[PDB]
Amino acid sequence: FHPYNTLGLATQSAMVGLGAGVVAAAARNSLATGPRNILTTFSKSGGVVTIFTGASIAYVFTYCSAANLRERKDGWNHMWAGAATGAVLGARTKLVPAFIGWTVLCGAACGLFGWTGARFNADRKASLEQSPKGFVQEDAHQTFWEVVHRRPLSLTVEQLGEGRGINAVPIATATEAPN
Amino acid sequence: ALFTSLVGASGLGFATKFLSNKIRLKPAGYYPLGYVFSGVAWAGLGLVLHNVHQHSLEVLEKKKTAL
Amino acid sequence: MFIGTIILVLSFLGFVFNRRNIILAFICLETMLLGINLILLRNSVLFDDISGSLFAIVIIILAGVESAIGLSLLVSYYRLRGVINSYGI
Amino acid sequence: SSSTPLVKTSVNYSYGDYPLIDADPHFKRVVGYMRPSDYGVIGLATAALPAGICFAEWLDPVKGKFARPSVKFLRVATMLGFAVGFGAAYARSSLRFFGVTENAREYKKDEAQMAARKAAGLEPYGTSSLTPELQEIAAKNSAHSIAGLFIFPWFNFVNHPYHGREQK
Amino acid sequence: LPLVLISLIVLTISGLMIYSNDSILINKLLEAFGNDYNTIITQDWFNIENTTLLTTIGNVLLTNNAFILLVLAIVLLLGIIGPISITMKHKE
Amino acid sequence: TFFHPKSREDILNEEAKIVQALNNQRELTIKMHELKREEKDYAHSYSPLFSDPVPQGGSIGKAPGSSRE
Amino acid sequence: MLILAIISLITFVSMSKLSDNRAIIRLINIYLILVLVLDSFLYLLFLNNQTYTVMGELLIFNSFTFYIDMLIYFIMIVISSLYGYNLYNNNLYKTLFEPKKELIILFLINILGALLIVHSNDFITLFVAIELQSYSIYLITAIYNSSYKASKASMLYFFMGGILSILIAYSINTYYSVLNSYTLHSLDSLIINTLDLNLILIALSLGLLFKIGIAPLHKWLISIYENTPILITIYISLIPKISILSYLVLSNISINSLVISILAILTLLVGSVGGLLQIKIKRLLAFSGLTNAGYMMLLLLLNNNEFSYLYYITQYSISHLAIFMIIIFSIYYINYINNQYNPIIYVNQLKGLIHDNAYLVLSMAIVVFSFIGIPPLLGFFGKLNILMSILNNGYYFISIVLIVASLISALYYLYLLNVSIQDKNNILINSNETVSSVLSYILSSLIILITFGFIYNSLIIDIFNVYFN
Ligand SMILES: CCCCCCCCCCCCCCCCCC(=O)OC[C@H](COP(=O)(O)OCCN)OC(=O)CCCCCCCCCCCCCCCCC
Ligand SMILES: CCCCCCCCCCCCCCCCCC(=O)OC[C@H](COP(=O)(O)OCCN)OC(=O)CCCCCCCCCCCCCCCCC
Ligand SMILES: CCCCCCCCCCCC(=O)OC[C@H](COP(=O)(O)OCC[N+](C)(C)C)OC(=O)CCCCCCCCCCC
Ligand SMILES: CCCCCCCCCCCCO[C@H]1O[C@H](CO)[C@@H](O[C@H]2O[C@@H](CO)[C@H](O)[C@H](O)[C@@H]2O)[C@H](O)[C@H]1O
Ligand SMILES: CCCCCCCCCCCCO[C@H]1O[C@H](CO)[C@@H](O[C@H]2O[C@@H](CO)[C@H](O)[C@H](O)[C@@H]2O)[C@H](O)[C@H]1O
């Protein structure tokens, strides 16, 4: 893998969240009911700026940190980032069990989002349609979407491990009397 | 088979007539000629689908023959 | 390109941030169509192409019919209510 | 006046399993090559629509009691039914021209008609009042227009040479 | 004013960026403002007729695009039939 | 003596015919998925009669020197 | 046939009284039936997916569009039957459901615009047809001008559709500015990967999609569907959706868009959650249509989506018509007429319908469990084919969102059934008035289709494999 620059990405994160919070505050000011002016965009906004900035900083910082600590790029980093973002969103409600639930559940949700590829889109060169499918032809290495009538036994033993029934030689041939 | 398809489509037509009579809060034998009319209508639809399907299969077989 | 984008954007903002009238909404729609037609005709001239002018004259016709229908709908609303107020469409 | 094409066309294209006659047949040909089955379809629709509204009045009547619909509605019904039937007949004959349905009779008739036209030194598919460019535009407007019979009617009246056949 | 200004900037800049095919985003605005160099108008002698813009509009609208004219006819029919349905009250 | 079950051979043969029909439907589904999403002709996809994609434009001031291959 | 119908009905309605409009609707309903019977053999033109370009290159005709047109004729037949045949021959039902003089003409013109949208190959035709649809459907929302709510909805719908049409025109003219063309056939592999073109194309897609309620722009159309008459809602909630989504499915415009994915997820979540606290029937059904529109948005990202879209739109049309017809039939047993225009508004007015009409509740149950996607019904096979396509094309998070939305929507779908199978005091014991024969048969036929159409899935696939592949 290639390391992430935490502080730079998180500074970009904070500026983006700040701009988004300003836009949401302006939208709230214009959509609202009561008497309002150019003063109220930050007085009467329900912590929108702090929501956006905190979520952005927390998510990007935690993601890049976990990617640099774990030394990997996978969906567990999105699980941690969701845990942190949920902790921020749940510290607003000044209650412990709601904070814990927010953390755990948005961690699980963003971790699912990362497990599935960290994308609302598709890869479109890893999809089943664009990838080699069906039965594999002549002793070739079975790819992900390919099908096989009969698999290699060394592969089974490595993927699964010896023990609990699964052995490098069948039992009957391995116990056959040398006659 | 054709006869099976026509019988089943006529059964669907009888079901429509029955459910119509019941939505109307009438007895199930209110006007028994409607069963005959529904039968022949739905059987005509089924015959149409049967013929379309048969022509489709004939096309995909003519392709093999010409291949 | 510039005049049309400017008229379009300002008409859209004067439609969105209108707390005054319904007539301003009608006007902003018509001026939006105007801006599109002007961009369209400038490109028609630069490419030396007729499809743009055809689309433009079609927009003229369609916008006329739009105005007629919209101001019939307003008249029905006024048939029932008798006053078209600052708010409530 | 020259009756020679400006753009290239397909030669003997296959719209179905049967051979091609004309890819954009004239109204005259589509009506003259009709079969008695087509006229039967016309009469069938012409009779079915008014009978249809009387059947509807029998099933669920407008007022409480059954009353045969006015002759007003029966007249308009007959007219609309004849129109629907002419549409279906024109479509059947045009699909026979395209090679989508069985067209052996129409094939031999077209062969004989074109041979007689060549014998009389006449242009195949006729001579037009329009320039070649307008013949092209007309063909491109009318070609395969029967596919949109559900929406709009459009028919060939222009005598263009862009029927999808060999040059002679 | 905040949303008005934000939307003014965003919408104008996007409307000027949308017309160019360049990949980098900032350059897409910079090409829109690249109105510096004049167009040369040379003269040809191939157009023999007196065809103007209205003549060509008619030609294409009545030959190449006859369908949209005969659909605009139904649009104008709506323009007549709708307002009567909405404004008039039919007695019986 | 009341037990009159279908023999093993006929059972195996009937099951084999069923599996052969199922594999035939499989191969048909694969063939149809492959015949779709396969590039078709301009005549089959757009225009069977006017099969020339090349545009011939206006005609009122046609300049010699405007066509190009 | 439609233009013949329009030009005939304009004259025949001008020269006829208001006492004749119901019979006029009956006549044109039989006309559409005869057309769909006699002229439907044209499917043979599209054998092996032969495609035709008509009116220069302004229209496109293939199996997809022929099917959508047959479907729109079927829908118009049902909607015209609801106006041409009285449910009950009482003074109440001659006060609630009366056709206005121009309504049938506007319906046929809107159908014309719908079909010229799906058949469009050039953007000038698309724009003319979009406007012919939208003007006519403004006037359809407004024709019941004695309703305050309907006039208000007319004007809101005018302005919002106008703005979204401005967006469509901007997209079209920008496409022209870039490529000097109005035709999407002008695009290929090379032009897509050589020009960055996604802003224009997604602007077009969203201008078309927000006209059918795609979030976050759903509240206005849901208010319009609430505030309109029931027999107008049944039309204006279905036919525009079919038209625009069919155009966007035939035109492969958003094959792997991130914005469309995001907005489709948002449509699913909103259409599932927002319908949970709705106490009114039409808003509930509007949010149902919203989430189904999301399911159909998902297959704008596929490039091979004909079977799934056609199955789902057909089954959704049948279910939509059936549920609105059941709500129309339930008015005889509700104990409180709310309006002259929306006689039934709230779901709790359906309380105890099983004790007055049990088989109507059987129909409701079938339709509700098809909406939920319960096998062996038709919505299950719809959802299955959609899932098949989106998982074959690599949308794995959207699939889980789809399952969660399918589950959350079941609650407000089951609200109806639950209150319908509850007990009620003051049940019905006798009634000498009988509901119509024709409308009863139509509803029963739709229910039987939902219930027993899975028998023919093999045959439908075998026909599709010849006419669409
Ligand atoms: C200024 C400097 C700029 C610097 C450059 C960088 C800036 C980045 C800016 C990013 C965009 C920020 C936009 C913020 C959203 C708009 C503001 C908003 O409030 O949206 C909601 C809006 C009003 O809501 P409100 O009136 O406040 O009342 C709420 C009570 N429920 O009401 C609305 O309906 C409008 C909704 C708009 C939504 C847009 C589409 C969002 C897509 C949703 C994503 C969902 C995907 C997640 C899927 C997970 C599935 C489990
Ligand atoms: C209709 C009412 C009348 C008013 C009209 C107003 C003018 C119209 C403006 C344009 C048209 C509206 C477009 C609607 C928004 C949705 C556009 C869209 O979704 O297209 C995005 C598309 C990429 O998305 P996609 O194709 O789905 O994903 C694959 C990615 N490779 O394509 C793209 O990649 C987009 C390219 C990115 C650049 C966007 C430009 C924004 C620049 C703003 C900078 C402002 C400066 C900083 C902040 C200032 C605030 C103080
Ligand atoms: C067509 C009127 C639609 C109105 C609604 C009624 C549904 C009719 C379904 C027939 C479709 C067909 O048979 O066709 C199959 C089509 C393409 O075939 P096609 O080109 O259209 O040829 C058909 C030629 N016809 C018109 C002469 C018949 O494939 C599809 O994806 C259809 C998906 C629809 C699934 C819904 C199944 C409903 C159960 C049917 C119980 C009888
Ligand atoms: C509400 C209950 C939720 C519980 C249900 C959980 C089901 C979620 C689906 C889990 C399976 C997803 O499958 C996952 O597998 C492979 C690894 O095997 C991931 O692995 C792939 O990730 C993507 C993202 O970098 C790249 O293509 C990468 O090269 C790798 O191939 C995929 O990103 C994902 O598709
Ligand atoms: C709840 C159960 C249902 C969940 C819904 C989703 C079901 C589908 C599961 C997701 C499939 C993910 O599959 C995706 O990742 C695998 C790796 O694991 C990749 O498979 C590829 O991995 C690469 C390594 O990166 C290797 O070279 C391997 O030989 C293969 O080519 C493919 O890019 C793709 O097939």
Swiss-Prot record, chain E:
The chain crosses the membrane at residues 1-21, 66-86. Signal peptide: none annotated. It comes from the Eukaryota. Coiled coil: none annotated. It is found in: Mitochondrion membrane. Complex I is composed of 37 different subunits. Core subunit of the mitochondrial membrane respiratory chain NADH dehydrogenase (Complex I) that is believed to belong to the minimal assembly required for catalysis. Complex I functions in the transfer of electrons from NADH to the respiratory chain. The immediate electron acceptor for the enzyme is believed to be ubiquinone. Belongs to the complex I subunit 6 family. This is NADH-ubiquinone oxidoreductase chain 6. The gene is ND6.
